[PDB]
Symmetry: T
Subunit: 150 residues, 12 copies
């Protein structure tokens, strides 16, 4: 793709992801409601901050970020669904994990692309984000009784 198009795509993804995290926090039940609820507050903030960093970096290389729900929905590859059928804590975490893995695999594409375009700053930004995602993956997989790449 190009670097601008990549970052914008992640602007949309991250605004979908952030609303999903609220969905999980609002609808979760079970013995881990307090501990996992506060984990989702923290996740909400961090993913809000990555989103800002992506948008502001795109601004800084001369692009124009998506800035409506309509545009996020039209461009996100991260998926959402309304909450209807009760979902277990394990199933919410599995959804969360699925999304983190999706962002991990797309950032890895952004990392390669951005090395080929010689955009050293955006490259480095995306790698620091992947470092945090990879650590979240291990922890939530561990919560689900699984190994990180299982």
């Amino acid at each position: 793709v190009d670097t601008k198009e990549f970052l914008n795509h992640q602007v949309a993804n991250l605004n979908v992801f952030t609303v999903k995290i609220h969905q999980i926090h609002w609808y979760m039940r079970g013995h881990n409601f307090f501990t996992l609820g506060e984990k989702m507050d923290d996740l909400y903030s961090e993913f809000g901050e990555q989103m800002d960093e992506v948008a502001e970096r795109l601004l800084a290389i001369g692009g124009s970020p998506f800035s409506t729900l309509k545009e996020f929905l039209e461009n996100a590859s991260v998926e959402e669904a309304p909450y209807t059928k009760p979902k277990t804590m394990d199933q919410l975490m599995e959804d969360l994990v699925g999304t983190l893995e999706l962002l991990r695999d797309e950032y890895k594409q952004g990392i390669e692309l951005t090395d080929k375009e010689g955009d050293d700053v955006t490259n480095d930004m995306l790698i620091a984000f992947k470092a945090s995602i990879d650590k979240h993956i291990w922890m939530f997989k561990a919560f689900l009784g699984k190994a990180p790449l299982e």
Copy 2:
């Protein structure tokens, strides 16, 4: 509309508005960039917390929060548009203020509803949010040379 429906309606509104605040921040230019930039981060957080409290209050009365972009679009009275043709710092603050006014008047309806249904907590919450909106309306109107209600 009953109390549950009012509140969910505001959950959607606030998510549209929050994303709007980011639009104003991302795309603002001119001599006031720095000082309205900081004010927009402040508004982003304040309305983010408002949206959280509205959702948790709805949860606490037996209701089910809207929790996806598509649901927020389907139900929001707050309007958004993509940023296409440049806009002045004044033009952006006027959309901001125009959206604040919308929320003020709709919170006023929620306050009356909620008082007739005898829901004293939701009533109190809505008032304190209004006190803040009234103050922001006075301040951003002063920024544009105008009296609050004028």
Copy 3:
């Protein structure tokens, strides 16, 4: 009941509830001991804070707060029992919830009585507390796997 009596009745209830929260903390066992332990410490502080405000509000409208364990036992509707034969972490939490639901329903009576008697301050006080009690019933019921209003 007049406002002074209603306020004094809650001084009693809250000094009983306060001791009950320590009972739960001290005796609780099972996989949720740490997170529920910290949550009991927060509830303890918070409800002793309420109690203090209740008594101070009673003092300021010219009343005389109960001020002995015996007076609290004589006047409370919140019940206690000594801990004898083990109960599980669901059983202690259901007892907790039951008591929050009693303080909510009684606070609602106090709200109405206080409105009728034109005491705006005590009214506002009580409503603010019910906001917090309502939040706690939602949260603690989500922990138990159930909806807020059961």
Copy 4:
């Protein structure tokens, strides 16, 4: 006399009360000098914050706050007098308490008036102020060896 004129009247009162808090602080003698001097500091700040929130609230409903000593003098119901004759600390705390009594009764009038006008925010602001005043009235009455309403 409507909400705007009531708020404006309190701007004048609170500026007179504030300067009377300095007069007491400056002229006090006796064994309680240090602990009541510190009390007057806290009261000076607290009452300077009410004044600000009152003037900001009047601005937010479209009014114009009095903004000169001359204007506070033409309009205040709170009385002041030059410090010609030394007084005991008890007599100074009687004058203090008599002014808090005046402000409580006046805010009561504004509370009823602002409920009749459906100004929910100004109403709620004034109740919160009345709660703090009633607490100070209990305390300074206790300092003087009397009950709150006496």
Copy 5:
């Protein structure tokens, strides 16, 4: 006796003391209202933490803490009475100092017992509270114009 019984006996005493500290706070009147009320707040926190630590130590050695108002009244040697007739500040302080004296002396008894049973931790815990108590006795008797042990 034995150590566990002695600790439980103090769980009951400290809960009664703590309610008595509140009693003195709520009802005191006279020139020392502010400083002494402040001090009662400090004593209230300090003795409540003393009580948790007594209860947790009891838990740590296989005990079962008293955990009701009923059980505290049945086992406490600390005496409580309802407030009816007005009391001086001095008279309230003489009650406070006499209760502090009674806990000191039961603690010395407890320190000797726990020495003989070889419970080093519980012995150390009790020596440290007697340090604080002894300090409070000197300080409050000084407030009353008296030596610490006259």
Copy 6:
């Protein structure tokens, strides 16, 4: 005028100035509403503290500070006027600067006078106040597009 008369005179001035700072905060409009609003909050509290220090120093030399709005008005050389026509942000800043220059020039008189009377503490205090005033003059003249002394 001797040292005590001079200090008393500035107690009156500073109470007038402090109210003028509020008038400027409350009635200000235009693009610098936010940044200038915070500057008057800082000025308000700085000049309140100058006033407290002037008064306490008048006390410490055997003086008796003016302590009513009536005395402040009767003795102050600083002028006030009711807010009747809306003013420019520039015009309001010219009234601020104009008042700062008056205080600067008068303090210069107090500094010579107090040097002549050999009162070294009052001399020192007044010189530290002048330093801060001279800096406020540069900065606000700079804000107005001007050099400090033209």
Copy 7:
């Protein structure tokens, strides 16, 4: 054994325990991953401070602390095994708990030895550590659904 060799034996014990706490943190899985993860960070820090204090007290009486993995291994009574077979959260905490039990019983012997030698400072340091170990034992055992001394 004299005091020196005892304290040195705990330098080695503590170095093995501390690496064991890391083993538990790194390999834990299941629903208590998040709550116990943070608990192991706290236990890691607390037991690393115990060891510093043990070594410094050994240095202050003229001893010479073990200072290699090799010597810690040759002298520790605490045992380690490499992680191979998967283990439950429950098995890991039982290892943790058994190991705390070992430390408690060895310190009880150091408290006797150290009293017989007349070394009052080391005795006191050892009693404080035992206090904290015993509290930890009650707590982790309660997480496991058992009483402290079972």
Copy 8:
């Protein structure tokens, strides 16, 4: 004298004053025990820092500070006496005030001497300490029911 001997003379005085502040704090009795206790801690700290500053200034200008109790006693104009007969708070507070007046009056001599000799740093340091001493004379005189100078 000269500047070096003057500073050394005050090093001695301040060490005699600071032990007196402890004496007043240790022997004080009566209703003001708690509040005056706290002011004695603050004066001790403040007068201790003033001493270090005087001694380090003495060093900066090439002098050699008195550094023993024997030299302090041999050089100080400040008097001390052992505490034998009982003394009231007032009597304790009047020795405190008499001592500040002496330090004030000697600092005044040192100020004049330091002006003649051209030591502008020492001159300014002495003036700042007299500002605080003057303020303390005002406050403790006022605690005694007296004007600062008469």
Copy 9:
């Protein structure tokens, strides 16, 4: 031409740039004085920090940083000139943005150079600084009414 040469060149540049940030703070006039003035304080610290990190990195790889104004002047590519002719706020910020662009482009060279010599640490330090520079180029261009890559 090698890593050491480049890093030293930037030590020279950053010391010229820093003094230019001061020239801008000291001479700026107009309505943005307060907000741009604070912005220069922050840039001043942040480029001083960068300079130290460049100096420390040169030192870490065996170099000898320039350490005199004479050396900075002879070696710098950033330009300076005495402030003589009046400059507009915009004109000063264009000079800033211009100097920022020069550093961005030079850092780009150092990034490719340090890639080819295999100095990964210096490479990564340079990438991090350019990220911050690119963002300030965006923000200041936006203050000027302009796209970042204009």
Copy 10:
């Protein structure tokens, strides 16, 4: 070697280094006792943190950290030796510097290996650790009277 075995090898090395830092601190003597003690506290904490991140990163890529003293000693290239004979400050710090140099050199191989395997995140973690190591070698060598590569 792959990434996983490199990282595990450093888990081993970092647990040996950390214990050697303690050896240095505990056996420090001379004029440098306080300055070097402090610096060793800081280095212990830093290398402790470094270790956790190495372990956690290995966990995140599907590996299995060494987790016993036994495996650390079996796998480590960093050497240790018992303190059987007194050594100088200089010998202890030369050891420190040489161990730092080995870690730099091996991390340099890991940076090359992770680059070749396309592990962007690990590569970047390792480069930031080298930045700090290179800076500690400069500083600790400057302390010994030598240039960084001498």
Copy 11:
């Protein structure tokens, strides 16, 4: 002797020591001036807390503290000498170590005295102080290159 006289005796010792720590600070010269003057500032404060605690414990047991320089000189075994002949940093430190050693050995006597009197609180305090004294003896002897007990 008895506990009261042993405590007074140390009130005199600590007062002599505190002044002595100041002498070391003030007259100290050479390469260790900064690294050791900071440690003298800590030792000053620390032995100031100790002296307070001794004095207040004496008061709490019915004693009457020495409270004049004269009384401290009459009663102390810690010796002081005026500074005339210059001294090595070595010499001043040796006199420091020698004085801490005296204090250690007199506290050892107080500990025994206080065990045989049954004063459990005073005993514990004296042990806590000797702990810190032992540490200081070791650290300062390490700084001089001696082992703690040669």
Copy 12:
């Protein structure tokens, strides 16, 4: 030379001195690397503040500060030389002391000139700076084994 030219001359000096403090920090070797390194940090920010205060004061009396390297070099009396051949810590500290002595002597000319011109603010600021310089001169002179004035 007048007050303006003196102040501008010190803007030049302070910029050379601040860069000399960096030269000292960067090239220092030996046993005080860490402790003096940190003193150079404190000094760097302290004379940086002095410079800002001198420039802002010059601004506030209608002056125009030098604001380029070329101007500072042309005007300064403080000397600098490039770091070529190696220098001891003492030699570095003598260069530092010699420069502080120069500033002290020049500031004393500015103290006199500024007294003759009736500029009280600038006079007081310069005395405060001399007070700090004199303190530094004693401490660094003592480091070197010398008396302040020799």
